[PDB]
Design a protein around this ligand. Structure first.
Ligand SMILES: O=C1CC(=O)NC(=O)N1
Length: 224
């Protein structure tokens, strides 16, 4: 099943260097189901961030791992289905920093699809997880794929703001040093990290200033 049949053409051209690594992950995920070990998100959502145009990404948000709880992970980092309540704790924290920063009402639901439609790539360093076992798919070979994806967005001769949430900041800043790119970091919005530097980081209106700075359009961050 060639990438072109799983992701947007731009992305498929961007990810040809790791097309094998991608196929190998499909074998891994197949072996996981065979062994009675489901994964999240759903197979159709695993590469979903790369379903929005490679050539339209203005802001890259990089997390760690998909939500480990069944019903949560939808293949856009931090996003959940429109009817999901309560929200996952990372998303609740994000939304509070959202209203602090931008002064907009608390969003209705946790569906971050509007951001994806407006050039925000919602990326996780690792794109699958064993349910109720956080970070369980670290080291399984996603890292090569997300690094090629990040490296490819940086070499793209267009403005990019990277928002590096959590332990992958110092690993990802180097891939993102380029005249057209700025990487801003904070501790992860997860409950244990969020109090020591996520709250008050005002990343959304920082991102916008850096864009307007680079002559590019600001993101409209407004969620219904
Ligand atoms: O809880 C979560 C969900 C996600 O998509 N990305 C993260 O790093 N943390």
């Amino acid at each position: 099943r060639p990438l072109s049949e799983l992701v947007e053409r731009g992305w498929a051209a961007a990810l040809e260097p790791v097309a094998d690594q991608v196929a190998h992950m499909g074998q891994f995920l197949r072996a996981e189901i065979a062994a009675g070990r489901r994964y999240l998100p759903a197979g159709s959502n695993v590469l979903r961030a790369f379903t929005f145009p490679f050539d339209n990404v203005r802001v890259l948000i990089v997390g760690q791992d998909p939500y480990p709880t069944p019903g949560h992970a939808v293949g856009l980092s931090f996003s959940v289905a429109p009817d999901v309540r309560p929200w996952p704790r990372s998303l609740a924290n994000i939304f509070d920093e959202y209203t602090a920063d931008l002064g907009y009402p608390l969003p209705s639901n946790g569906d971050l699809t509007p951001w994806a439609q407006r050039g925000v790539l919602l990326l996780n360093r690792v794109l699958t997880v064993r349910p109720s076992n956080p970070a369980s798919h670290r080291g399984k070979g996603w890292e090569a794929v997300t690094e090629c994806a990040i490296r490819a967005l940086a070499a793209r001769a267009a403005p990019l703001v990277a928002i590096l949430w959590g332990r992958d900041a110092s690993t990802l800043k180097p891939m993102l040093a380029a005249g057209n790119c700025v990487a801003i970091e904070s501790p992860h919005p997860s409950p244990l990290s969020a109090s020591r530097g996520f709250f008050g980081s005002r990343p959304f209106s920082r991102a916008n200033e850096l864009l307007v700075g680079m002559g590019a359009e600001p993101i409209d961050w407004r969620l219904p």
